[PDB]
């Protein structure tokens, strides 16, 4: 997908430090792969949560503003593209994705938004976004 590749390209451009400087900080966030046509509202939640995570005051302090704005534009386009194409099962899938973002939120707060903690999270989202969009 061109949109997916562009989203990843912008998240790669946002990188400030190398994860090679943070290899002892490897952390498993338990991305619920078990939840991923029926996966469209689940992928929608995933993109909305990436937008939420990178739109906080903490994210604005950590990453370049011009690159973040380009990133939001691409996430907006992805959300729009998904809207163009059992309710309780869908709710359950959405709740599992939300718990994964809750672990990321707690981790950044616990690590006091350090450069390594933000690079661990950025690399985590490069991986889970690639998986969720089956790129």
């Amino acid at each position, epitope marked *: 997908s061109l949109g997916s590749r562009r989203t990843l390209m912008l998240l790669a451009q946002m990188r400030r430090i190398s994860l090679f400087s943070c290899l002892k900080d490897r952390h498993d966030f338990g991305f619920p792969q078990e939840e991923f046509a029926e996966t469209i509202p689940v992928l929608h939640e995933m993109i909305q949560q990436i937008f939420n995570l990178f739109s906080t005051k903490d994210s604005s302090a950590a990453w370049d503003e011009t690159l973040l704005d380009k990133f939001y534009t691409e996430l907006y386009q992805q959300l729009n593209d998904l809207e163009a194409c059992t309710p309780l099962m869908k709710e359950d899938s959405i709740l599992a994705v939300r718990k994964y973002f809750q672990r990321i939120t707690l981790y950044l707060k616990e690590k006091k938004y350090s450069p390594c903690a933000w690079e661990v999270v950025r*690399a985590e989202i490069m991986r889970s976004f690639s998986l969720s969009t089956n790129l």
Partner: single-chain antibody
Amino acid sequence: EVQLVESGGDLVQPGGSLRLSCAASGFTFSGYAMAWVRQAPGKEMQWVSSISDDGGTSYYADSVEGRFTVSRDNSRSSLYLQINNLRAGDTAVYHCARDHGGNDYGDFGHFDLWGRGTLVTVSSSEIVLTQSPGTLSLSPGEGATLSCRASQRVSNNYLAWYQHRPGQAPRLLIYGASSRATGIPDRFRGSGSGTDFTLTISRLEPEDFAVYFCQQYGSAPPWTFGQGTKVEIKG
């Protein structure tokens, strides 16, 4: 020609020391993280040390920390390993290796270029990867199915497969459990996730009869290797 050539290995007495060197050519050395990986006779490959492209960050295996020092000289395209207070456990072929990991994903700890190695002969929880079978005896044109089982879930599917032909430096075949490295033919297929990984070779050519070994690079260091499966011709 893209190459890594090690030197410095020698017969050495216990307690003694050596300075190993690796001359890199055919590529911009200063853009890559590098590593030393050793193999003792009859043993699995063992990651020893890694160093960042600029030499500002290094990692070591616990058994060599404080005795070994990795360094590099980007102006001379060279990597070094000063190995001190040597013991029986340090006897091994020492390979220089280029990290295939990129900054985009942070997938460091696996290697797309290796040297043949330099020989060090001293006179006289980690993830465990189990490969099966130990030896596969097959006919020309037949296929092979190789197994690599990890004792813990391999994070991010960071599981690599390497081919080792006699007299040659190891070669990366697969990275990220299923991605074929540049130039690797379609007949090599990597698959699996979690703890169970598979390498399939659909039709063996003469050059495919070799030792195949797996490696996980999902953990924080140390990154670990399987003991290898030798694929041989059923004479």
